[PDB]
Amino acid sequence: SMENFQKVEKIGEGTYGVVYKARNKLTGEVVALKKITEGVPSTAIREISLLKELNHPNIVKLLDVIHTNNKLYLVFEFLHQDLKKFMDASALTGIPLPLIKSYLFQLLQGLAFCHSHRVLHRDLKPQNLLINTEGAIKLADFGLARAFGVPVRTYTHEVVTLWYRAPEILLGCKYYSTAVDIWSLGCIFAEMVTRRALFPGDSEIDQLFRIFRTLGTPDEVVWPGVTSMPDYKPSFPKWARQDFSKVVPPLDEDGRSLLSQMLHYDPNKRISAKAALAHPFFQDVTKPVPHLRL
Amino acid sequence: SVNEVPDYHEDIHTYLREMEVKCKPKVGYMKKQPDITNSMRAILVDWLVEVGEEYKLQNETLHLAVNYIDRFLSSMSVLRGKLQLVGTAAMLLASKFEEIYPPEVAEFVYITDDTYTKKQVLRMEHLVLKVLAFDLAAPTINQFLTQYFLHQQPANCKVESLAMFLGELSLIDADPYLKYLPSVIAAAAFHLALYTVTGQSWPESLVQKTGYTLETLKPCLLDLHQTYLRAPQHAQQSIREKYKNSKYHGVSLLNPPETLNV
Ligand SMILES: Cc1ncc(-c2ccnc(Nc3ccc(S(C)(=O)=O)cc3)n2)n1C(C)C
């Protein structure tokens, strides 16, 4: 229980509760402690049950659950910071490309492992992607995740933090699947390169229009079924699709190829995390430590 | 389609096969319960079927809750007056895991007709989480069935519904069905449904996916055929009632075949 833990400082906070840095007094291990009516919340039930199954080097490790009459603590391995903080700290240097590549490779490994174990993450924003001083990056916060079936069955709609939300969610499709998480990582790949969110919308319609302005307004040819989708409107402006080299100018040819396959409109055609691991962008991938103190 | 996860369905299947062995209840537990019987359990499960109808819950939710109850009862001795409290907390946990809109705790107290308080239900929720060590993502018959249905040539809605119905019937009787894994009951239910409706058999493509043959499926298949033949006379009827509905293509009104010709 908590007698062996010494709190150090607050590191994070949303509706879920609050997260502290702490240390195990007996082993020295540094941890994150997340402290949490209708009884135990569904987000915590999902987070704990799914994370108990997911042991992978690019998934944050749940070490323990301390379950009291009054409170629930989740104990995680400690990571130093989120990717958002690191992007900001790299403001006028940029993030060196070997690090971007290493980070994306790791994120795809973590995600493919989720998908292989029937888990959709559904909130891959940079605040949920944690980095340590050794060069690792890991998926965190599985509160919004879900165990899926094959084939998928209708799940919660309008999921995913809006800037990272896939068009099939924005257009209200009856089903969505693993491709939603790849859309998000695509948005993250772009963002690691520019340090700016690729599609920073303020409402669902503005998010769609920003997507359309960058990738072209989709039509039956590019995305069969699109004009029949529940929230498609035949009044939607028709923007031409804009050369990918203009979308993320510093990206080479391989990078551009992988980004375009991660941001494909048709969720059937979009690349899987598993297949992305073999993309020629990663031909020279390594695992360097981050270039800044964390 | 990505809705059928082509790049992951095989990994997922292998993983569920691995998990169903680890999540498996103790086959002999009911003998070691001093106060409850297979027939009290049959009553609870049939009651959960109705609760699921009343609140429009997913079939997956029902199957999960039964998995929790059986795993719980495998280590915890329970008096008859408390069985329904275990079952209610289980259905609550299954709903929070699996449903978009779980019913509130007050609704779970109300369908027990105030046999238990909100405080008892919530205390039991925590006990069930503690006994299962939050291991709630359990494989079900349903999760294997939906993958098996992708091998139909072509899709037949009556086959699907009837296979679900038969899978569901298996939940009511601990004897014999505690001795079979979810993947095996689903396979027997799928074969039996396919044969009742179309005259066809367990396809070669599913022999390739699962390693199961009509030979490995025979013991479960004989049990399931009897359960199907006797369903009209079973003391518990909620599943038959439910599967009369057009949602499930009235499949409980279909006649079981007299023989299987194995
Ligand atoms: C919600 C949640 N559940 C568990 C964690 C979690 C797990 C392990 N390590 C950390 N470490 C950490 C996070 C954020 C920052 S920050 C905002 O100051 O850059 C600094 C360190 N956090 N989390 C995170 C996502 C808050």
Numbering used by the authors:
A (entry chain A): 0 to 35, 41 to 298
B (entry chain B): 171 to 432
What text appears in the publication on this structure?
Members of the cyclin-dependent protein kinase (CDK) family have diverse cellular roles that include regulation of the cell cycle and transcription and, in certain cell types, differentiation (Lim and Kaldis, 2013, Malumbres, 2014, Morgan, 2007). CDKs share a conserved protein kinase domain that comprises a smaller N-terminal lobe linked through a hinge to a larger C-terminal fold (Endicott et al., 2012). All CDKs require binding to a cognate cyclin partner to remould the kinase fold from an inactive conformation to one capable of phospho-transfer. We have used biophysical measurements and X-ray crystallography to investigate the ATP-competitive inhibitor binding properties of cyclin-free and cyclin-bound CDK1 and CDK2.
